[PDB]
Design an enzyme around this catalytic site. Structure first.
Site, mmCIF file in Angstrom:
data_model
loop_
_atom_site.group_PDB
_atom_site.id
_atom_site.type_symbol
_atom_site.label_atom_id
_atom_site.label_comp_id
_atom_site.label_asym_id
_atom_site.label_seq_id
_atom_site.Cartn_x
_atom_site.Cartn_y
_atom_site.Cartn_z
ATOM 1 N N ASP A 188 -19.818 24.120 -10.671
ATOM 2 C CA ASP A 188 -20.024 25.110 -11.722
ATOM 3 C C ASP A 188 -20.151 24.499 -13.117
ATOM 4 O OD1 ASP A 188 -19.880 27.361 -13.380
ATOM 5 O OD2 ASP A 188 -18.331 28.309 -12.146
ATOM 6 N N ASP A 236 -26.016 27.539 -16.279
ATOM 7 C CA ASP A 236 -24.833 27.730 -15.444
ATOM 8 C C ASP A 236 -25.115 27.799 -13.945
ATOM 9 O OD1 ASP A 236 -22.381 28.349 -14.388
ATOM 10 O OD2 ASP A 236 -22.170 30.268 -15.435
#
Ligand SMILES: *[C@H]1O[C@H](CO)[C@@H](O)[C@H](O)[C@@H]1O
Length: 323
Positions: A33, A214
């Site tokens: 992430d 992201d």
């Protein structure tokens, strides 16, 4: 090693991507992430009833507990996870750090438990936003970057297929042409950047778009003005209140969506915008509103058509078309 790579694979509908890593003496799949600075894992401390079916980490002889440290992360849908912390060896495709802060989950929501292929997260955002208290910890990349050939990592997520994460170098076999860079804004702890312009189908706009890259977000979340404009180009599209987003007839033609970075065009094929079937012959769109966030999120829907370089020097973000 000064360089290394790992294979990353998507779950159904490319909802998330899982990557195998070793933590201590255990091997488990984590969600890389770039929007988070925490590395947490299902562990032996996680209730047996909550880690059933999951690979998990057991703090052993090489683990060193950071006494008094705690962590907690809350998500939009309400899902949450929290626990304590140990320093241990974390290895990602040959690149390792012997005392990485590993956040051990002492509890997780039912959603996490049900997602058996997901055993944690490996944050790649800036350490400035790591949640550990009372003292925040350094991310894996922050710990190993000086030992890499180059202080960078790259991502080439793919649609319904294996992709890669490269550490310390760029893999010329994964992209075509040259890499185009743009400055990064890390003031909020994210890999923030600003696309110079964009285009819905063949209709370009000279307006920029500011947001973050992201890998931990599923969709491409943009301003309502742009989302509305996009679906205005999709016959039969409509906002589905029950789905919490725009849907359209599964057979509807979807235009491509691209953003301009310098002299490079990052194109999202219309194909990737037909995200998931929601029954009744309707499909949920890959592009949705960033309402409530305050900024745009270039999630997996967008990233999976690109080879993106996260360069700590600058910092900067590079883009190139996948091979
Ligand atoms: C990391 O990648 C570099 C560049 O390909 C290699 O030289 C090294 O052996 C490792 O695989």
């Amino acid at each position: 090693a000064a360089t290394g790579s790992v294979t990353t694979n998507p779950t159904s509908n490319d909802e998330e991507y899982i990557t195998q890593v070793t933590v201590g003496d255990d091997t488990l799949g984590l969600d890389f992430d770039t929007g988070s600075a925490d590395l947490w894992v299902f562990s032996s401390q996680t209730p047996s009833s909550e880690r059933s079916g999951h690979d998990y980490y057991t703090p052993g002889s090489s683990a060193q507990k950071i006494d008094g440290a705690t962590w907690s992360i809350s998500y939009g849908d309400g899902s949450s996870a929290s626990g304590d912390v140990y320093k241990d060896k974390v290895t990602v495709g040959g690149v390792s750090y012997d005392s990485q802060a590993v956040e051990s989950a002492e509890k997780v929501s039912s959603e996490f438990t049900q997602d058996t292929a997901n055993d944690g997260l490996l944050g790649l955002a800036f350490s400035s936003i790591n949640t550990v208290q009372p003292t925040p910890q350094k991310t894996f990349f922050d710990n190993v970057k000086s030992s890499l050939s180059e202080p960078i990592f790259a991502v080439a997520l793919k649609h319904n297929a294996p992709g890669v994460y490269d550490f310390g170098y760029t893999d010329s076999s994964k992209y075509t042409g040259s890499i185009t860079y743009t400055d990064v804004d890390n003031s909020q702890g994210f890999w923030g950047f600003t696309a110079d312009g964009y285009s819905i189908g063949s209709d370009s706009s000279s307006d920029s778009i500011t947001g973050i890259a992201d890998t931990g977000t599923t969709l491409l979340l943009l301003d309502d003005s742009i989302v509305d404009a996009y679906y205005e180009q999709v016959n039969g599209a409509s906002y589905d209140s029950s789905q919490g987003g725009y849907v359209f007839p599964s057979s509807a033609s979807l235009p491509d969506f691209s953003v301009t970075i310098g002299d490079y065009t990052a194109t999202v094929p219309g194909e990737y915008i037909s995200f998931a079937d929601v029954g009744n012959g309707q499909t949920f769109g890959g592009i949705q509103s960033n309402s409530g966030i305050g900024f745009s999120i270039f999630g997996d829907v967008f990233l999976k058509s690109q080879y993106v370089v996260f360069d700590a020097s600058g910092p900067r973000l590079g883009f190139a078309a996948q091979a």
